[PDB]
Homo-oligomer: A and B are copies of this chain.
Amino acid sequence: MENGYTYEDYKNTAEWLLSHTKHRPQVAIICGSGLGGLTDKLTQAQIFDYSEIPNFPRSTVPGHAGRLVFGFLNGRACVMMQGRFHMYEGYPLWKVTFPVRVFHLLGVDTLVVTNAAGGLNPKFEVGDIMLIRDHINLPGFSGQNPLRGPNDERFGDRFPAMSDAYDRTMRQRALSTWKQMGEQRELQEGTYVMVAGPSFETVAECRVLQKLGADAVGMSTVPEVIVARHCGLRVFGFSLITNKVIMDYESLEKANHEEVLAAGKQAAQKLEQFVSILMASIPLPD
């Protein structure tokens, strides 16, 4: 196997974007199904459908893939992904993570990734936000890693480290910003496990993930993190706990998409404000 994208392709996509927008972002944000609403908060907002952009992964009905939205968020030059790609849709990971390298070539230097996730930590609650300290890349252990294939030193090295993936600084500064909001629920912190889905975990699977020391489980994010780190982007991110994964057999309740979307709605505002304010803690470039 090999990544279908040459270095030229990534360059080409970047230059097309450079040519079609006056904006020069520093921060890339990937909005997890939870918070697509964040694009309202940008100013001088400029939108591209993924479908117009050269080399972008395609959805069968082109618009459902989503949009790149350049603008200013709280004084930071941002580019946001509204709509993202998952491996459970059929995308190889070198497609799932193609935007990330586009971003880097655009001059972006930081990545913010957000997502919804099911709560593995018994103490978490629906509505909680959990900062990401670390991850467990289960698909990666098997071979499903976005870097699989020949390495291009122009992006990064053959064997990058992931022990430092999630910026220590941004994580402290984020605990700050949370006192500033004066919230009843404390800001949570922990390990995100990626699994591929798309079906939901069984009781026995949940117990396995708990025992790996994971706190939250989703089906995205980790690959984008690995590619970001590979090419030198600073990374921060968090999860919205939309549900507490079913952990025993007597319970009559089931994990479902409607209630994940619903939970997304409650924490909607909360999340925007949160990310928006965090913007200011991001070091300026140079």
Contact = CB atoms under 8 A, between A and B. Distances in A.
Interface in A133-160: 133-145, 147-151, 157-160
B249 A133 contact: yes
Given A141-B139, A204-B134, A198 B255 contact: no
B163 A202 contact: yes
Interface in A148-190: 148-151, 157-165
Contact of A136 (B137, B157, B205): B205
Nearest to A256: B161
Nearest to A149: B90
A92 B205 CA distance: 22
A142 B145 contact: no
Given A1-B90, A142-B142, A147 B204 contact: no
Interface stretch (A6-14, A36-44, A207-215): A207-215
B208 A162 contact: no
B144 A143 contact: yes
Contacts of A213: 204, 207-208
Identical copies in the complex: 3
Contacts of A145: 88, 196-199
Given A138-B142, A148-B90, A255 B205 contact: no
A199 B255 contact: no
A139 to B, nearest CB: 5
A246 B214 CA distance: 18
Nearest to A222: B202
Contacts of A198: 145, 147-148, 151, 158-159
Interface of A: 1-2, 60, 87-90, 92, 133-145, 147-151, 157-165, 191, 195-205, 207-208, 211-214, 226, 229-230, 246, 249, 251, 254-257
Given A142-B143, A191-B204, A211-B211, 14 more contacts: A60-B150, A87-B143, A88-B145, A88-B148, A90-B148, A134-B204, A136-B205, A139-B143, A141-B142, A142-B144, A159-B198, A159-B257, A162-B205, A165-B202
